[PDB]
Amino acid sequence: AEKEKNAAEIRQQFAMTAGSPIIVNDKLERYAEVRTAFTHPTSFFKPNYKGEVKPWFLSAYDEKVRQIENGENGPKMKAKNVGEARAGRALEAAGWTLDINYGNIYPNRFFMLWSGETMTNTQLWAPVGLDRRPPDTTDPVELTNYVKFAARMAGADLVGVARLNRNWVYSEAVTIPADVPYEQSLHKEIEKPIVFKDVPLPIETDDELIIPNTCENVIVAGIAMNREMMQTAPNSMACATTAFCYSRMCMFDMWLCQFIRYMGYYAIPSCNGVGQSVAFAVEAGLGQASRMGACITPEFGPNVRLTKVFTNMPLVPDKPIDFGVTEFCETCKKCARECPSKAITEGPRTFEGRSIHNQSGKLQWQNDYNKCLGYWPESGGYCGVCVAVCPFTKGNIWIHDGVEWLIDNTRFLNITEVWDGKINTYGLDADHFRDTVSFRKDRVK
Amino acid sequence: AAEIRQQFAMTAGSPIIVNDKLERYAEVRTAFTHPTSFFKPNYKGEVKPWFLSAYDEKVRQIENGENGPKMKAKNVGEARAGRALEAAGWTLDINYGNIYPNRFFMLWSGETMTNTQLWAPVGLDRRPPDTTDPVELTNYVKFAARMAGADLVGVARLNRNWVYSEAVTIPADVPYEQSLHKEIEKPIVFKDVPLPIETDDELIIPNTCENVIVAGIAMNREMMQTAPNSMACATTAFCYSRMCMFDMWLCQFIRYMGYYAIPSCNGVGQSVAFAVEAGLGQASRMGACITPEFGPNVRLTKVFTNMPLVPDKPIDFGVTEFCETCKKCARECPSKAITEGPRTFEGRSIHNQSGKLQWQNDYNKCLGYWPESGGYCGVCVAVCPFTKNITEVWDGKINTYGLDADHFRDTVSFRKDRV
Numbered sequence: 039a040e041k042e043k044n045a046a047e048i049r050q051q052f053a054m055t056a057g058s059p060i061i062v063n064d065k066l067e068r069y070a071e072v073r074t075a076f077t078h079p080t081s082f083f084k085p086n087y088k089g090e091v092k093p094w095f096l097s098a099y100d101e102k103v104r105q106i107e108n109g110e111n112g113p114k115m116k117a118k119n120v121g122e123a124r125a126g127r128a129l130e131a132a133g134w135t136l137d138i139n140y141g142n143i144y145p146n147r148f149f150m151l152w153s154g155e156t157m158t159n160t161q162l163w164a165p166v167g168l169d170r171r172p173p174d175t176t177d178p179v180e181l182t183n184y185v186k187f188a189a190r191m192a193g194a195d196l197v198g199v200a201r202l203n204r205n206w207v208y209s210e211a212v213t214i215p216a217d218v219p220y221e222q223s224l225h226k227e228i229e230k231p232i233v234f235k236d237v238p239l240p241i242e243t244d245d246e247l248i249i250p251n252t253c254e255n256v257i258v259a260g261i262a263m264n265r266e267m268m269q270t271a272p273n274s275m276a277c278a279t280t281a282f283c284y285s286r287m288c289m290f291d292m293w294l295c296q297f298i299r300y301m302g303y304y305a306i307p308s309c310n311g312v313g314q315s316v317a318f319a320v321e322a323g324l325g326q327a328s329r330m331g332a333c334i335t336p337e338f339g340p341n342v343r344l345t346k347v348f349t350n351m352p353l354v355p356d357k358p359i360d361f362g363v364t365e366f367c368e369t370c371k372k373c374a375r376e377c378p379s380k381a382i383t384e385g386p387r388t389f390e391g392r393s394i395h396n397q398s399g400k401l402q403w404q405n406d407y408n409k410c411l412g413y414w415p416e417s418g419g420y421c422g423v424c425v426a427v428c429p430f431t432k433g434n435i436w437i438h439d440g441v442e443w444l445i446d447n448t449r450f451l452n453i454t455e456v457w458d459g460k461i462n463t464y465g466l467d468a469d470h471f472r473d474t475v476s477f478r479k480d481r482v483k
Numbered sequence: 484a485a486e487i488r489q490q491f492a493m494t495a496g497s498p499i500i501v502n503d504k505l506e507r508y509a510e511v512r513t514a515f516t517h518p519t520s521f522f523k524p525n526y527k528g529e530v531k532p533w534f535l536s537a538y539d540e541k542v543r544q545i546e547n548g549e550n551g552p553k554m555k556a557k558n559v560g561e562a563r564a565g566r567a568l569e570a571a572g573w574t575l576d577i578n579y580g581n582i583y584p585n586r587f588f589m590l591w592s593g594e595t596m597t598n599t600q601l602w603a604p605v606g607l608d609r610r611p612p613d614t615t616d617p618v619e620l621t622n623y624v625k626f627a628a629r630m631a632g633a634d635l636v637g638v639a640r641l642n643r644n645w646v647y648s649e650a651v652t653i654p655a656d657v658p659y660e661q662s663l664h665k666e667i668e669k670p671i672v673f674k675d676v677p678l679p680i681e682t683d684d685e686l687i688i689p690n691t692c693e694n695v696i697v698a699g700i701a702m703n704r705e706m707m708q709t710a711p712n713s714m715a716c717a718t719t720a721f722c723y724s725r726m727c728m729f730d731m732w733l734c735q736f737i738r739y740m741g742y743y744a745i746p747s748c749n750g751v752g753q754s755v756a757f758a759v760e761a762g763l764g765q766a767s768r769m770g771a772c773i774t775p776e777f778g779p780n781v782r783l784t785k786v787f788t789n790m791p792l793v794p795d796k797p798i799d800f801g802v803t804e805f806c807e808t809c810k811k812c813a814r815e816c817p818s819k820a821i822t823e824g825p826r827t828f829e830g831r832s833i834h835n836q837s838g839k840l841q842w843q844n845d846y847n848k849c850l851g852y853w854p855e856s857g858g859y860c861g862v863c864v865a866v867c868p869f870t871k872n873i874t875e876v877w878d879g880k881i882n883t884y885g886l887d888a889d890h891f892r893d894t895v896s897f898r899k900d901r902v
């Protein structure tokens with residue numbers, strides 16, 4: 039008979055021995071965040087459909103407007119009517135409500151405060167003194183169970199812990215000066231170094247963002263996106279599940295940082311800022327790196343967003359996982375073949391970046407992320423075709439052969455219906471939600 | 484669960500029985516806010532705002548290694564963790580409930596929000612609606628509501644009887660750090676105006692504001708069953724922040740569809756009445772809306788809008804007749820706040836709205852137990868048949884947002900059950 043799926047068993051079966059799985063060489067340096075395609079001057083500008091050169095997201099706005107006027111849900115993709123086209127973009131735009139300027143990357147600004155002191159919640163609770171009382175628990179085992187339980191309350195579908203590898207922390211962040219109001223933010227962005235110093239608490243000076251040398255650990259969360267909506271990539275409903283998950287990330291960071299602070303430790307939120315989420319997720323055992331470049335998880339494949347929190351709270355690091363992704367990506371190449379911009383390489387992994395947007399010195403598939411971003415104004419969205427076509431995104435991949443779990447190799451061989459179809463709270467799917475049930479034994483060993 | 488809900492659909496019409504004495508209720512009359520109930524002694528005999536006296540009890544409990552009143556924790560560390568989780572859960576909530584309208588997270592226009600500003604070149608909030616069909620709009624907005632974190636969603640015509648006559652708020656330029664000391668009353672009125680607007684004198688809801696969308700946000704059963712101890716406080720708190728995110732997300736969706744939207748959380752009006760009229764559940768002896776999926780172990784929020792929508796039908800699955808003979812909450816209530824008598828139209832005190840048929844409870848007695856116990860009690864929710872130690876909770880089953888995969892299939896939704 040069919041053995042019922044057991045996600046905890048799967049992770050136990052594929053657990054590796056301790057050690058960062060990412061292979062590096064001597065040319066590895068920390069990466070300046072301004073080099074990402076979203077921010078770098080070589081890639082930031084893209085033409086719109088009239089040939090006007092603009093910040094990429096403004097060119098994409100132009101395409102969204104054109105699609106709604108023409109009753110389309112995506113490039114060359116007719117909607118049922120203009121109202122359906124309108125509804126998809128209204129859902130997408132609303133999803134971003136709790137996210138600043140597409141990713142919350144400015145450290146210690148807006149929602150990403152590095153101290154809780156000025157928050158309305160901290161002020162309301164100040165008489166209890168939870169953020170000023172020394173920790174009552176220093177045992178990493180108990181702290182790991184407490185913080186992972188809190189992480190699930192805070193909206194994580196996956197959570198893992200790693201020691202902080204500074205190689206993945208940006209050498210300089212993109213931010214804004216502290217006196218700049220929101221309406222000027224996009225015009226006043228600056229770079230600011232992230233440094234590690236012997237100080238008691240995270241602190242920002244005029245010159246530096248300072249992380250304490252005591253900042254030992256990173257907690258990584260996976261925030262699951264909706265399968266049906268992502269499968270509409272590159273059209274608007276894939277944009278909407280992306281957007282809503284960014285606001286879920288923001289809530290997660292603030293909730294968890296406050297819990298950690300109220301336990302007597304400090305906590306640094308980040309969302310898409312501070313450092314490279316995929317590398318942290320791999321080191322924390324959420325999944326493995328992939329050809330497309332994302333972290334592929336056993337539960338969701340790559341169809342999951344990542345955020346992370348940095349802390350001095352003593353914790354037990356999780357073990358990395360190896361469930362064969364590297365070997366499958368070596369022969370699969372579906373994302374590379376379906377990529378509308380040919381951004382994803384079909385070749386082997388190397389240590390040599392394809393362009394300024396890649397960090398050299400770590401073994402990975404090297405993709406051209408300027409080509410990727412170029413498709414976003416063209417399509418009026420955030421694409422996601424690679425996530426959508428990846429076999430690991432299917433809910434169907436795990437089988438048990440009577441002895442152990444394995445991947446089913448057979449897997450690698452419209453929007454109106456989405457609006458009219460299955461949905462549940464936060465876009466989670468009750469057919470798979472048991473996969474993320476958690477007891478103490480899977481939170482800490 | 485879609486089976487049961489249409490099996491128990493009533494015909495259209497508000498099921499709340501009223502008389503000609505009914506008047507709209509001033510929000511300041513709630514036990515949280517009224518001067519006769521706001522101050523309570525702490526365990527040392529010092530009289531303070533009730534939540535400050537409760538704070539003193541939380542500190543005393545942590546020091547004494549307790550998770551609740553006379554409830555020893557495994558150690559001081561466990562006691563601390565429960566209160567840290569509780570305090571963190573409130574991160575996206577202002578002053579216990581987000582009640583001040585058109586302040587902080589509860590803005591009545593999206594125009595100044597960072598998200599609206601970023602999206603302004605697209606013009607979604609300025610473009611006339613492309614859809615005016617209430618059937619399609621009901622399907623769209625309910626789908627959005629599930630994306631926004633509602634476990635239940637319903638629609639009713641707006642009954643102004645349940646809108647507060649006057650809100651508790653603060654002056655618009657008062658900074659957060661002075662908010663608790665500068666609360667004021669302000670009338671909520673309905674006028675022929677295009678958009679929701681606030682003047683120096685009034686909160687003005689348009690006469691075109693036809694509908695209310697009510698969301699149920701499920702609490703965690705294991706944690707609520709620790710009532711009156713700290714983990715019940717934590718699931719309460721996290722759900723208040725889920726309420727706030729729901730309101731903001733859904734208001735933005737409605738605005739980007741070409742309509743206006745008023746968020747509320749615990750402000751603006753009486754959630755239980757709206758929830759009953761929108762078919763989420765039935766009123767109960769304890770006073771909560773009891774739902775088939777969660778019983779009373781579910782939080783409520785609501786959004787008011789001129790968006791054309793199809794009202795849901797009220798539901799009758801026998802709660803009234805069950806509460807008539809049960810009385811379990813009334814017998815377990817640590818403060819004897821809940822009546823064992825029959826329903827009447829006459830409030831027991833200033834905290835009740837007279838003129839509607841309900842079980843009349845003494846809500847000052849309830850609030851009095853909160854500083855004593857250092858929490859938000861919830862024993863009534865925990866013991867209710869419809870709802871069905873702390874170390875075992877921390878070591879036990881949990882899942883995303885505290886939802887339970889053993890029951891999460893009950894809130895799956897297709898178009899057939901949305902409209």
Ligand SMILES: Oc1cccc(F)c1F
Binds near residue numbers: 139280
């Ligand atoms: O604008 C964005 C859209 C989707 C994902 C991102 F990280 C973005 F910055």
Ligand SMILES: Oc1cccc(F)c1F
Binds near residue numbers: 515578579580719749
């Ligand atoms: O349910 C609540 C719990 C604590 C404080 C409040 F104001 C509430 F409304």
Ligand code: SF4
Binds near residue numbers: 328427
């Ligand atoms: S589509 Fe294939 S090659 Fe690309 S990331 Fe997925 S498994 Fe790897």
Ligand code: SF4
Binds near residue numbers: 373376379382410
């Ligand atoms: S998001 Fe689209 S354009 Fe970018 S790599 Fe994936 S498939 Fe290619």
Ligand code: SF4
Binds near residue numbers: 815821852860861864
């Ligand atoms: S919350 Fe507690 S004190 Fe209040 S009515 Fe319920 S059981 Fe009674």
Ligand code: SF4
Binds near residue numbers: 767813863866867868
């Ligand atoms: S405990 Fe019994 S009387 Fe009280 S609300 Fe629940 S069913 Fe009704």
